[PDB]
Amino acid sequence: DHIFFEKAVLEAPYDYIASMPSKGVRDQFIDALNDWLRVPDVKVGKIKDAVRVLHNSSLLLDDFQDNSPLRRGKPSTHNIFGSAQTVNTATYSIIKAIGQIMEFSAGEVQEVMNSIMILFQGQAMDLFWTYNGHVPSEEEYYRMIDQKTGQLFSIATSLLLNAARTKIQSCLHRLTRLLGRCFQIRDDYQNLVSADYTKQKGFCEDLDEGKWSLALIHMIHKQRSHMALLNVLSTGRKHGGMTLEQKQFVLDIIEEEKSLDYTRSVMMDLHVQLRAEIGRIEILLDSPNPAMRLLLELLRV
Amino acid sequence: HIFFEKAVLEAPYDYIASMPSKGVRDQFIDALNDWLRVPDVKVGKIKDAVRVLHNSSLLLDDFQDNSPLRRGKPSTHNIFGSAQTVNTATYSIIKAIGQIMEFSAGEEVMNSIMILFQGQAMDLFWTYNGHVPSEEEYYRMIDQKTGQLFSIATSLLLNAADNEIPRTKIQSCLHRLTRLLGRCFQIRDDYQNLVSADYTKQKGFCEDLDEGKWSLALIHMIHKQRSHMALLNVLSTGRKHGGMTLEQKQFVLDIIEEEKSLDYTRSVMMDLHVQLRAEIGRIEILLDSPNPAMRLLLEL
Amino acid sequence: IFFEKAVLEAPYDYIASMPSKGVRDQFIDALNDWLRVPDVKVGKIKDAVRVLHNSSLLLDDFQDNSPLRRGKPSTHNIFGSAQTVNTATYSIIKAIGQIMEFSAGESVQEVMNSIMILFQGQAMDLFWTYNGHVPSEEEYYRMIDQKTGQLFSIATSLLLNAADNEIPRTKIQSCLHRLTRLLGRCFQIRDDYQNLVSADYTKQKGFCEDLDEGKWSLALIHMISHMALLNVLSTGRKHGGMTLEQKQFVLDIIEEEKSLDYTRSVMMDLHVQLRAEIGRIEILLDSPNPAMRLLLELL
Amino acid sequence: IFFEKAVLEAPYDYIASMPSKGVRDQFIDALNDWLRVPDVKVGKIKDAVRVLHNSSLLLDDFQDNSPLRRGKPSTHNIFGSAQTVNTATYSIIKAIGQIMEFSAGESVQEVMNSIMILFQGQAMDLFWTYNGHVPSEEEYYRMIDQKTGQLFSIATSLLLNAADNEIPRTKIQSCLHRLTRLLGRCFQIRDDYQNLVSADYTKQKGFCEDLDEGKWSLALIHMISHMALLNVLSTGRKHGGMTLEQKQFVLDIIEEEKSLDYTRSVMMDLHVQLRAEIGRIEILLDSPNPAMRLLLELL
Amino acid sequence: HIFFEKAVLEAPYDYIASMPSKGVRDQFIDALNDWLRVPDVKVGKIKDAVRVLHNSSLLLDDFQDNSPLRRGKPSTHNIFGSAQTVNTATYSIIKAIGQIMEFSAGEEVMNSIMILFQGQAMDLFWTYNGHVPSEEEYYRMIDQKTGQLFSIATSLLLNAADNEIPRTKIQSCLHRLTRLLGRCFQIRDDYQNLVSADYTKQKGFCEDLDEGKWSLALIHMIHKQRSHMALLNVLSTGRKHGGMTLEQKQFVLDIIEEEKSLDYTRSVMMDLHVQLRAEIGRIEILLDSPNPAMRLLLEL
Amino acid sequence: DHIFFEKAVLEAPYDYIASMPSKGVRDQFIDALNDWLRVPDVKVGKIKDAVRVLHNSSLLLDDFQDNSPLRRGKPSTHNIFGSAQTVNTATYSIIKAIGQIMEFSAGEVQEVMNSIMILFQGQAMDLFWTYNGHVPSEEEYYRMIDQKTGQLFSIATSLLLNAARTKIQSCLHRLTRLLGRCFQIRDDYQNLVSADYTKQKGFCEDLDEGKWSLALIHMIHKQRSHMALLNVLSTGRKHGGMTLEQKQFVLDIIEEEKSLDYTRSVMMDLHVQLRAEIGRIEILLDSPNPAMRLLLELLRV
């Protein structure tokens, strides 16, 4: 009878992150997208649960892969169960999510499998650059984002699309791709700027991780000296993190170079294109979508 | 250079795949196919898929057990780091599943794959929280984390077998076979980790004592009526730290030898060998097809 | 020559200078209102028990790796673990010698036996956290009777052996044993309780010090669907202790399951039994003890 | 119930199972050839002193952070520091209780006082390495008389208090005190010596274990132009201990200055004084002691 | 890009040089030159040379004292690492010496520079081996490691002074001045490290208690007849570890306050202020040239 | 009177390295060079002592800068006295060495000061590349060597030259430069190959340091994959060193690529040029020099 006990052990790390609160964008996008597609409540529920597992599982891996001590102000899962159990649960949960997607969807699965694997191709580059200290170009950065976060929006879109036109499809493609860039570029921006992100992750958590955000990329390829900046980055990699003053030192250089102003420029332009794409769909479709415009608006600053 | 980013993604897999396997996995498929006689191309695809699953499991396991060595060389996460290694490992499992789908469509797997993680879950859970499992829990965990690999390969080969009869006679016997093989190979593995000098050369001296896993020898003497305060506390000391000193490892070995607990493990393995030979025999006669390959695989 | 003595007793003189007090001496004064032991012998008993209690504090702080004691650095963060342990062990021997100096016979072989039970209790405490065993409620209570309640018992045994002739120390026994047992259980449960609730117990020991130690308070034990809490304690065992965020997570689970309420109910029941016990003794000795009842009101 | 006792005594039963022996019991047998104490009481004295000596080994190994004892892991690398210290302190109390069980009067207050001097000696030992003070030869010798020579004194005090009636335990005193003092000084100096020279003392404790501890052997003290040696000891204090290469460097300086020879000369002089002392006692008791002279030949 | 490798070499110097000095060093040279009146160009060269020496000394000292903060910002070796920082520091000292040679030729320096290291040697030696120095040893060490900087600048300015007389009257007085200035500034520095909240903002809370240096306050109360077992042992505990906890630092402060040992340091500083004003006075009259700048420099 | 005690404290770290044994090449080169120049015994003694201090001081810094636990089988100086005292003594000793050079030499000093500073320019690049993980080109590597080790030979040469022609000078320049490259390239080679270097420094000490030797440089810029090789190097930098198996893994890749064969090729060609330069001088001068040819021969394999 204690087969239930074994299941609880296996899914304990998953039940942890899924329990905090943490959500927002994911569920909102599915709801907003469905205000257009009008997919049955039962089918969107099956899609929601699968995407949630998929998203939460990648968070389990990401926090471990990025060595993040905090998620949503609480300890990250691998600081509760340890990295070994967390990774084991996460990998299992992904397979479980794929099985669920198989159960209500035909094949094509052979399209979702492909896109799920693209997510890993995206993570691969992100982790590769961080680990070996290679600064990517701005375009490589965008391509990486399209794969690791943009593809995540695409998956939820493809699922809802297959449960509902024709030309409308190649417009949602432009939507999810632009949306993916908005999310990540904001996420990297807010990590260094916002004080909520400071409370839900720690002060400049990305600088401990050593990820290459758009601000750093822009000023690294910006032709001036930066002997100091280059060396603290190396110092951080050698110590596995930075002190509060070191992070502040990085921010001040960023401020002095106005590289965050560039990031703000890209985000505003992205919102312009996304506004246009949304209205393009609302016109091409029956009626407008305040839910999608809300989500877009939640993504500025 | 679209080729470059895939190379980065699959670099940790190519590393572990470039090492000498020992080919236990491949030898079994070959032996099983001496009975089922599936065409070489279909067999090759199944071999490739299972090889990817197995190697990916080793990627994860070495990191999870914090093993410094794999086949005498540094473990994969001591090349690419934990993050990269885990990422491709999960990806490669997805990829293998995708490969399996392309030539099969059915039907157990993937589902049986989820049982692997169920087995690992218990293995990792006990080790992390220091809970000593019973012999039955130990066996059940092994059926899930190890025996299932064999089950996977069999089902794949079985579903690809010709209409040359029966798939009804064999299935009961084949399940008995893969399960017995799974137990013995893991029990042998946990046994050899402490006594074999080749394993010392491949994994380091008594690597499982660093990992802190619960092998049959330890389990047997702990649930004994004799007191083992020292033994219990060294194991806890090893988990508190990153592992054990050589003297701490040697101390455990002395306790084991003093109580001949490895001899109990030898007895269990021999008894499993007997049942294995019996099971192979029932099939060799029922199909009128002797299998020197399976009996040769047993030679371990 | 005094220098050698000052070096040996420096770690003791450190904790002894701390304000860590307010229960041990008040219990002796409260009990002596009954036993009416001469003030001089009460002084020696107070001194001896003070040395013992301080010595156990030296050991426990080291053994639980507590960084703070009464808001100041713990003794082994001043003198190191080696000097602290050596001084502590010496101080225990010194106290016993003092006890021997004013009491003989089976009184000594009773206190000696009683002191050894303290270590028996500490052993189970230390053994459980080190090997990651979650104790039952009964195991926990028995552990408390040995390591905490026995300290009260020592003080009473000393006082009773020096009691006035107008007092039947044979009728009174077992009633006093029932008292100290309840009192020690009430004190320790409150101690484990307060460590997770208060400040003091965040100002004096740091935030949730028991969770760094990996101590098994009554709240924690009552719970162990509780999978996440088991693992973080294990994570706390593998790491040097818990992060501020990890400790807060434990509190949330306790709060959600209202484990704080359970221990609160247990201590109120102990308050009831204690009042009933003091009453029986008050009738038996034909003497009211407002001090004991006053001491009881410490929650 | 036995389980609780087994847990408490597990760290003691660990060192007690080790072959760490060959001097303590031989001294008792040698001395008893003179004192002719009944075999039964000698047994209890042997048991009590054995518990004390083992308990001091538990503490010292932890306090000096020694990884190895008799080729096997030290006790605190089996049970952890907390359990080891608690058991050790308990075992000391237990032994004293045993001593109390067959001896009364000022005999106890003598052993109690003698045990406290052991801690006084350990205190100076621990205090010096922790605060980086290089002791003089006299300070070192006095430290030895307290922490080592006193152990012999305890055994003799017990045996003398149980001596046969045909023996004048008043004439004999001070001669025995002179003996134990010399013997303890000879034993400890040899102990500090052997730790840097031998194997055993590389097989039993690891290579130059005293240099990890930061112990002040007679060789080291005799030297402190010696600037480089001072700093590596400091480096050894800041780090967890010394590397294999660092220990070897210390040996080279010792060898170059022939510090090994000095301690060798000191111990030969101690051999002379010891023979003179045994002789005086042999005349005074009209009884030869080939055992003591046999025990003496341990170099 | 021959320019690039020099930029790499001087990058750690440019970092520390880009910070707000406080200009005590420059204020002294200006004040001294109100008397000696050396042309601006020759004064500028001397300022530049001394500035390089001083900054290079801070490069070395911050690493040697393992200080995490310098003027509120991370210390240089927490940017470029210990290796690079030390390399340019030694180089910059050579460079400064080369600069000094180009406009002088003589004559004390460099020689006086070697006394700086002699002072640092004792400072580092006592701290590393935990030896408590006497008040006299403490003063002598300070004359060498701090007072000599002032001596260097004076000799340079003195050798560049015009034939407008005397260089014989002043030298005795100027040596008395630079030496008094050196003691007071270091004693003030060690004082302010424990009590000034601005120093907490620039270096962290009680940084010297992390370094484990021997300030006058600690030295005074240690060589006292009262016992200080606790105080002594915390300091040793701090050296055993990387530094002290906040409670350990606060504990030391409480002992200091309880014994008013900082008041003794205040008395010494005031007495040095008195002698300084006296020495400035003897010179202001002997040259018939009052120096509001020197007296204003004293305001600290 | 205890002014001598303060001096002992200051020079204790210097007296340590100077005492072991460790020498060889330095004294041999000065003797071999003087078999030509015939400079008085008193003057060459003054030159020897100064160069020894200079060389030993740089070793004090180098071991600390490279985090080397061992020198000549014994603990490095900063593992006896600590990094702080070692660096303080080293810097002082360099200034002391400069003063000594000033005392027997005119100015031009203004030539020796310049060359001493070049040594630091060389070290600067070596430490910069190691710390920030930048692989230099082969020519940058050679230029760096000319500055940090080749210039050291040049200093001893300039000193002896100024105490003694005309055209002979611009031949010694080619000698010291070639000699500098021979020494360092061999030193980097022997670090990974020789078992004496394994005993006098530890197994593959350079792989812990993370320096960029010619073998690594050659195969890094050699166009093939090397995903594994690139990542262990990063792993080493993140851990502050490598395990025995990791170093062996690096050696095997080096072996597989025959990059050490290339290093052997460069060394043999260097010996060819050096043989030619030596004979060129022996002819241009009075008589041959077996001492210099010996030293050259001590530098192969």
Ligand SMILES: NCCC(O)(P(=O)(O)O)P(=O)(O)O
């Ligand atoms: N997308 C989830 C992961 C992140 O967004 P998060 O900020 O860690 O949630 P990352 O910054 O790692 O890309």
Ligand SMILES: NCCC(O)(P(=O)(O)O)P(=O)(O)O
């Ligand atoms: N189960 C595959 C991994 C093992 O067999 P391996 O010995 O690590 O290959 P484990 O002993 O960890 O179970």
Ligand SMILES: NCCC(O)(P(=O)(O)O)P(=O)(O)O
């Ligand atoms: N028993 C006295 C020691 C304690 O009360 P304290 O918390 O150390 O005061 P514990 O809770 O550790 O038992």
Ligand SMILES: NCCC(O)(P(=O)(O)O)P(=O)(O)O
């Ligand atoms: N005094 C018994 C303990 C010793 O002899 P040991 O070396 O621990 O046996 P020490 O040398 O530490 O004093």
Ligand SMILES: NCCC(O)(P(=O)(O)O)P(=O)(O)O
């Ligand atoms: N002496 C210059 C450096 C100092 O003044 P600083 O306070 O570190 O600038 P120290 O206190 O180390 O002496």
Ligand SMILES: NCCC(O)(P(=O)(O)O)P(=O)(O)O
């Ligand atoms: N030249 C002295 C320094 C070296 O040669 P060494 O091998 O450390 O002596 P490096 O390898 O650091 O260049």
Ligand SMILES: [Co+2]
């Ligand atoms: Co809707």
Ligand SMILES: [Co+2]
């Ligand atoms: Co992340």
Ligand SMILES: [Co+2]
């Ligand atoms: Co991430």
Ligand SMILES: [Co+2]
């Ligand atoms: Co992010």
Ligand SMILES: [Co+2]
């Ligand atoms: Co074929």
Ligand SMILES: [Co+2]
């Ligand atoms: Co494994």
Ligand SMILES: [Co+2]
């Ligand atoms: Co495993």
Ligand SMILES: [Co+2]
């Ligand atoms: Co295994």
Ligand SMILES: [Co+2]
């Ligand atoms: Co009263």
Ligand SMILES: [Co+2]
């Ligand atoms: Co406690």
